[PDB]
Amino acid sequence: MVEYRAEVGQNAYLPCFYTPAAPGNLVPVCWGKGACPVFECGNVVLRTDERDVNYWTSRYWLNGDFRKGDVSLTIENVTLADSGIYCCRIQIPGIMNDEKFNLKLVIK
Ligand SMILES: [Ca+2]
């Protein structure tokens, strides 16, 4: 687990990257609130798949290019309620092999 900081009223940046084969040949990724569970993400805030961003909402979005493996999460206009641990999960095809990144956001 690695810790990151943001300020109230600004945007949070939570880095998360992998190296894909090609822009149209990606690995599905999920983000969730809470430490990464055994499988999948809990409390999902964003999802991508082999070609598209399939799930996002007004305050949870990507500022970088997911087709290049930049799956870093932006949380827009944060409040103290956004403090906590987030999971970035790189859902490599196969069993028991995802990359599970735990990110703690501290907000002041
Ligand atoms: Ca897997």
Residue numbers in the entry: 1 to 108
Provide the authors' original text about this structure.
T-cell immunoglobulin and mucin domain containing protein-3 (TIM-3), also known as Hepatitis A virus cellular receptor 2 (HAVCR2), is involved in regulating innate and adaptive immunity and has thus emerged as a target for numerous therapeutics that are under clinical development. Human (h)TIM-3 consists of a membrane distal variable immunoglobulin (IgV)-like domain involved in ligand interactions, a membrane proximal mucin domain and a transmembrane domain that is connected to an intracellular cytoplasmic tail involved in phosphotyrosine-dependent signaling. Previous structural and biochemical studies have shown that mouse (m)TIM-32 and mTIM-419 bind phosphatidylserine (PtdSer) at the GFCC′ face of the IgV domain in a calcium (Ca++) dependent manner. The IgV-like domain of hTIM-3 has also been demonstrated to bind other ligands such as carcinoembryonic antigen cell adhesion molecule 1 (CEACAM1), high mobility group protein B1 (HMGB1)20 and galectin-91,9,18.
Here we report the high resolution co-crystal structure of hTIM-3 IgV-domain with bound Ca++ that provides a structural basis for understanding hTIM-3 at an atomic level. To do so, we performed the first NMR analysis of a TIM family member and solved a high resolution (1.7 Å). crystal structure of hTIM-3 IgV domain. For example, the AGFCC′C″ and BED face interactions that are important for stabilization of the IgV fold in mTIM-3 including inter-sheet interactions between Trp53 and Val93, a salt bridge between Arg81 and Asp104 and three disulfide bonds were all conserved in hTIM-3. The latter includes disulfide bonds that connect residues Cys38 of the B-C loop and Cys110 of the F strand which provides an anchoring role to stabilize the front and back faces of the hTIM-3 β-sheets and noncanonical disulfide bonds between Cys52 and Cys63, and Cys58 and Cys109. Notably, the B-C loop of mTIM-3 possesses three proline residues (Pro 37, Pro43 and Pro50) whereas hTIM-3 has an additional proline residue at position 45 (Pro37, Pro42, Pro45 and Pro50). Together with the presence of an additional aromatic residue at position 39 (Phe39), the B-C loop (Ala43-Asn47) of hTIM-3 exhibits substantial changes in its conformation signified by its transposition towards (~4 Å) the α–helix connecting the D and E beta strands. In addition, unlike mTIM-3, residues Trp78 and Trp83 of hTIM-3 create a hydrophobic pocket that allows for hydrogen bond formation between the side chain of Thr79 and main chain amide nitrogen of Tyr82. Together, these differences in hTIM-3 result in no apparent outward bending of the C″-D loop in contrast to what is observed in the mTIM-3 structure. Consequently, we observed a different cleft conformation in hTIM-3 compared to mTIM-39, with an extended distance between the C-C′ and F-G loops in mTIM-3 (~11.5 Å) compared to hTIM-3 (~10.0 Å).
